[PDB]
Every structure is written in structure tokens, then in C-alpha cells.
Amino acid sequence: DILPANYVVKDRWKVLKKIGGGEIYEAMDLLTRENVALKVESAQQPKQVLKMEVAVLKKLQGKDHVCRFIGCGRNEKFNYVVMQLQGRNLADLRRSQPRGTFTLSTTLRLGKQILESIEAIHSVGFLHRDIKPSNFAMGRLPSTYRKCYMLDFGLARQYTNTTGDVRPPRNVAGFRGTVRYASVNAHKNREMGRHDDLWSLFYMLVEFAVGQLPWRKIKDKEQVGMIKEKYEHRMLLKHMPSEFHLFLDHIASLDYFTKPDYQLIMSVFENSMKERGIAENEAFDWE
Numbered sequence: 001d002i003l004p005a006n007y008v009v010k011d012r013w014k015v016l017k018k019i020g021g022g023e024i025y026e027a028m029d030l031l032t033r034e035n036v037a038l039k040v041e042s043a044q045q046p047k048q049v050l051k052m053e054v055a056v057l058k059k060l061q062g063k064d065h066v067c068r069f070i071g072c073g074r075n076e077k078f079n080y081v082v083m084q085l086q087g088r089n090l091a092d093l094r095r096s097q098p099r100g101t102f103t104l105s106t107t108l109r110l111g112k113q114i115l116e117s118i119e120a121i122h123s124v125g126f127l128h129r130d131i132k133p134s135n136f137a138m139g140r141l142p143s144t145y146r147k148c149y150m151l152d153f154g155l156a157r158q159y160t161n162t163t164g165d166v167r168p169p170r171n172v173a174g175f176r177g178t179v180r181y182a183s184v185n186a187h188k189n190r191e192m193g194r195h196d197d198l199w200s201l202f203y204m205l206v207e208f209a210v211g212q213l214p215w216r217k218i219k220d221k222e223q224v225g226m227i228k229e230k231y232e233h234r235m236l237l238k239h240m241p242s243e244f245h246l247f248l249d250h251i252a253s254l255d256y257f258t259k260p261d262y263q264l265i266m267s268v269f270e271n272s273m274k275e276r277g278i279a280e281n282e283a284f285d286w287e
């Protein structure tokens, strides 16, 4: 641990505990009195990622589904970022379910919220590249307990320049993220694009509603990729709503350069809800 418990950052943020490990801590804000999330990076670290995380978090201020930026700093021993602390993550909430599945109501409403977060990061010129259940968390306040938040920009990459031109893909781009929700393109070590974050959303939603993915037990990265490539994705949609074939067909047609049709995907969730009598004001499964 970079920071021991009770350490005070800039005479304001007192360390309570390590939440996930850079390193992420729950801290006490001695000025405002609320608890906050505090992420640190050792100043000696070769590849410096938190400077990029701060840039992403700063460009997203105003958009829904992002933590409020509180502060940041650099010092001789560490670099740090302070942000609004969230609550329960989607991976822990799903494993807490009696069958390890969410209802279609929860799944569809989480899908809408995550897609908005995905379109938001893409609208500021970044790819997330690590879309997975544990990188999304519900709020911890009366005003945020039904809002889903996008977390961890440690694997993000700018896909544009200053003029909004799509930057050239590299010939090979070594994939760094998690295996389970990675698209086939990511497994092939090809430059990831906006469609690859949408592929991850698709695998997440299948898992939420079904409780498992076919490659779940496989640990070897290469084996998972080979199963995914050969796997008939239509078979994943057996117990999923019918419109998801439009979601799957659309993302399968995209390439690195092509801007996705976020409204086509959003209609897929909105029409699946409407055709089942699902309302926005509905209670989530953990409630």
C-alpha cells in the first residue's frame, strides 16, 4: 500500500481504507465531512496512467453517469485524484442474486444507463476499453441510489486528435483488458474502436439476463478468443429479446473508423421494455 490508514493528503483527505487497489482508497474529506474516493499513483511509476484518468474525468464533468471531480495533485512520492465515492458494483449485485441473474427489467434499465455512459466517453474522444460489470456502480445517496456510474479510466485511450479526426489504428495493439467481455477484435490484438466497447456491453447484458457466458470457465486468453470467433452469437440470443439481433447485426457490421448508431441500440432497449410493459420508475432487483 502506497498510503497507510490515517494518512492525510493535502491536510484534507484522511485515509480510511483501501477499496480496490495504482491504488484506490475510501477517504474522509476533513473540510466537507463526506467520504470520497481517492486514487493514487506512485511518482516513480514508469507508465503514468492517472494523469490521463484525470483528463478523462475532467472532460466528462456535466455528463450523467460520472463521479464528480473533487481534486488532484502531484508530489515527490505520489500523484493523486479525489472524486465522488460510489456504492455497490454491478458484479457484486449480480452474484448476490439468488440465481445469479437479474430480471429483464433490471438488465434493460442498466443497459440504457451504461450505453449513455459509453456514448458520453466516446463523445469526448476516448474509448473505455475495459467495459465490465465491476467497472459500474450504483450511487450511495438518496439523489443517486438508482443511477449507474462508469468507473476506472486506467485502460482508456484517446481515439481522436484535437479536430475530432479519428486517429490511425496501430497494425498491432496488444490487448490489456479483461478476457470475459473482450470483443473478438480485442482478442485478435487489433486496434480497438467504439464498436468494441459496445461488444462488451452486449456480453455484459447476455450475462446479466442468462447468469453465464459460454466461455466463463476458461482462463487462457487465446482459448476464449477462439471460442468467441467460432461461437454462433445468435445462439446467445435464444432467451434474450428478439430486437437484440439488430443490436448484434449492427455491431458486427462496424469497423474501427465507423461511428456507431447509438440510437439504434437505445431503441433496441426502449422497444424491448415498451413491448413488455417495463417502466423507468420500476424497482431494481436488489431493492
Ligand SMILES: COc1cc2ncnc(Nc3cccc(O)c3)c2cc1OC
Binding pocket: 019, 020, 024, 037, 039, 053, 067, 083, 084, 085, 086, 087, 088, 089, 137, 150, 151, 152, 153, 154
Ligand atoms: C465502493 O467501491 C468503489 C467506489 C468508487 N467510487 C468512485 N470511483 C471509483 N472508481 C474509479 C472511478 C473513476 C476512475 C477510477 O480510476 C476509479 C470507485 C471504485 C470502487 O470500487 C473500487
